[PDB]
Amino acid sequence: ATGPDGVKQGPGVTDKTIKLGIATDLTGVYAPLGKSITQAQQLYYEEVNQRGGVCGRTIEAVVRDHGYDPQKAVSIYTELNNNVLAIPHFLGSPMVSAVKQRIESDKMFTIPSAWTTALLGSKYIQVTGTTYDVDMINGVQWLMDKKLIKKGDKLGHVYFEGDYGGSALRGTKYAAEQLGLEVFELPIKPTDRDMKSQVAALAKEKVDAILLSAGPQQAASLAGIARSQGMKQPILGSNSAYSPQLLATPAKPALVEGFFIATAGAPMSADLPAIKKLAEAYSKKYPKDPLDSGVVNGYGGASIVVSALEKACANKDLTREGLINAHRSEANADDGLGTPMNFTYFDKPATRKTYIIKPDEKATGGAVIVEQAFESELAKNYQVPVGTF
Ligand SMILES: CCCCCCCCCCCCCCCC(=O)O
């Protein structure tokens, strides 16, 4: 329990090692993005280890694949929880929801790649960036500002049922109420591979804009089918409704025009020194794995946990209490990757600024900024739910 350097050691911490857990999707709908996130975290931890680790201890990240399935995530959580100090990458809103009570009981610092409001309200869970609702509020306001929609128009929102799509949808509906828009709602599951019935329904409803809270496979299908039907409505996706791999498929033309993504994260093409450095470092380590916005997300999550570990080390306290208090002492985080945040609270989003990006085969990371990160008044005044959607 206390190392020979006088540092208190919690679960997963020995005299020479700090074990961290990663619960991701390597095989399901988010496979290429979970790979990128996971590899970017490993890149960060390797760089740290090369510089002597933390508190003289090497960081070891153990990786489990839940396949974007909540029951498997639970099983994985119970296999890791007594033997890792923290979980700096846990992919997926329903997956982390399923273990929220255990996280709280265990005092497990968890950094999801998941942005539901259902994960707010826990000291131990850092929801990074914006929440999904705030991204759709910003995004709908942007559609109106850009005259892609007007008062009285109808939005069709295709969404993964539950925490992720439902949170996004909450934002859509708030914006629609405030702005005088109608909403047509289309729930889907991650196992729905083919969007042609959804496209048919969107067309029947004569929507003016199409919103999507799903993964890359659904985005390719929906965009491709819509454009093959002559639909000209803009498409606005949540932050994970795209991977650059899709540009190497016939969906490309339906993604590089008329398709936008609302996200708190900067793409790999942003003109920031830390982004350029990351692009070079990641490309060097993993030459065969395309750069994507998951790389940014994973490197950033690793940066968050390491910052907290270093502060906890300096307090001679690599326990779960020491770690969370180190993390929650940071009111002004800015890792240089394009998403400044405040970590001292957890009853509201860490930021309310959303970028609009689009797919671009010419750009580093397969995407470019269309609108620099902004917080609409609409989003600023919105009441964000805490621990539910
Ligand atoms: C700064 C934070 C926003 C960064 C967004 C980068 C997108 C990376 C890909 C994420 C894949 C995971 C999707 C999870 C969907 C869900 O919430 O269940």
CATH architecture for segment(s) 1-129+267-350? 3-Layer(aba) Sandwich (3.40)
Which residues are 86's β-sheet partners? Answer: 20
Classify residue 21 by its DSSP letter: E
Domain boundaries, the chain: 1-129+267-350, 130-266+351-389
Give strand ranges (E) for the chain.
Answer: 8-9, 17-24, 58-65, 86-91, 110-113, 154-160, 182-188, 209-213, 235-237, 259-263, 317-318, 354-359, 367-374
Q: Is 279 left (phi over 0), alpha (psi -120 to 50) or beta?
A: alpha
- Kindly give the pairing relationship between strand 367-374 and strand 58-65: unpaired
CA distance 157 to 241: 13
Residue 64 CA to residue 73 CA, distance in Å, equals 9
Inter-residue contact 155 to 140 (CB < 8 Å): yes
Indicate which atom in ligand 1 lies nearest the CA of residue 294.
8
Distance 11 CA to ligand 1 centre (A): 28
| PDB experimental method | X-ray
Ligand 1 and 33: CB distance under 6 A: yes
The CA-based diameter of the chain, rounded to the nearest angstrom, is 70
DSSP H or E segment with residue 68: none
Which residues on neighbouring strands pair with residue 186, listed in sequence order? 158
**Span from the CA of 113 to the centroid of ligand 1 (angstroms):** 5
* 6 CA distance to ligand 1 middle (Å): 38
113 lines ligand 1 (CB under 6 A): yes
Q: Is the CB of 38 under 6 A from ligand 1?
A: no
Residue 303 in contact with ligand 1 by CB distance below 6 A: no
Radius of gyration of the chain (CA): 20
Span from the CA of 89 to the centroid of ligand 1 (angstroms)? 11
Angle at 215 between CA 362 and CA 24, to 5 degrees: 100
Measured in Å, residue 314 CA sits from the centre of ligand 1 at 32
The CA distance from 45 to 40, in Å, is 9
Q: Is 128 in the pocket of ligand 1 (CB under 6 A)?
A: yes
Q: How far apart are CA 135 and CA 29, in angstroms?
A: 21
Helices (H), 61-152: 70-80, 93-98, 100-106, 132-145
Distances (CA, A) of 311 to 87, 183, 325, 329, 386: 17, 47, 9, 9, 28
Q: Can you tell me which atom of ligand 1 is nearest the CA of 296?
A: 6
Q: How many CB atoms lie within 10 A of CB 86?
A: 26
Q: Is the dihedral of CA 205, 206, 208, 212 positive or negative?
A: positive
| CATH superfamily assigned to domain 130-266+351-389 | Response regulator (3.40.50.2300)
In the sheet where 209-213 sits, what is the strand order? Answer: 182-188, 154-160, 209-213, 235-237, 259-263, 354-359, 367-374
Six token digits for residue 201: 């329904």
| Alpha-carbon gap, residue 144 to 132, rounded angstroms | 18
Q: Which amino acid is at 88?
A: P
Alpha-carbon distance 134 to 91, whole Å? 20
| Helix pair angle (273-285, 293-314), 10° resolution | 100
CA of 239 to the centre of ligand 1 (A): 6
User: Any idea what DSSP says for residue 15?
Assistant: S
Report helix, strand or coil for 54: strand
Comparing 1-129+267-350 with 130-266+351-389, is the CATH topology the same?
A: yes
Task: Note the resolution in Å, 1 decimal.
Answer: 1.1
